[PDB]
Amino acid sequence: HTLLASGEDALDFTQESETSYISESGAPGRSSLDNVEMAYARQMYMYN
Amino acid sequence: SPSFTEDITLSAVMLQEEDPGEAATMSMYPDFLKSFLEHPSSAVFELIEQYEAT
Numbered sequence: 001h002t003l004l005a006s007g008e009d010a011l012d013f014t015q016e017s018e019t020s021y022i023s024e025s026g027a028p029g030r031s032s033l034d035n036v037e038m039a040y041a042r043q044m045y046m047y048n
Numbered sequence: 049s050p051s052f053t054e055d056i057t058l059s060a061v062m063l064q065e066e067d068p069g070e071a072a073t074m075s076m077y078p079d080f081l082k083s084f085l086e087h088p089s090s091a092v093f094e095l096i097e098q099y100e101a102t
Contacts, residue, residue, distance in 0.1 A: 013056065015056035015059055015060035017063050018060060018061070018063065018064055020064040020065070020066075021064075
């Protein structure tokens, strides 16, 4: 009866999400990396 | 209303971004001007309801 009379008993709907792309940035000297990445740098440097 | 379907769908097509608010902000003004077109300047109250609804 609600649908026939344009009434409703409650309803819901939205839309989904799509890909969003973000990144980071670097810095020289006083740099944007971490001590973590510096230790990694030793490893990949000796490896390469 | 089509307005709600457009709201959800453009929320999907817009969420990728990070500053949707100003995009919608500018999107408002063409509606302002169209409304100025269809209705006079003594109908400011109906202007206000359309403001609020949109």
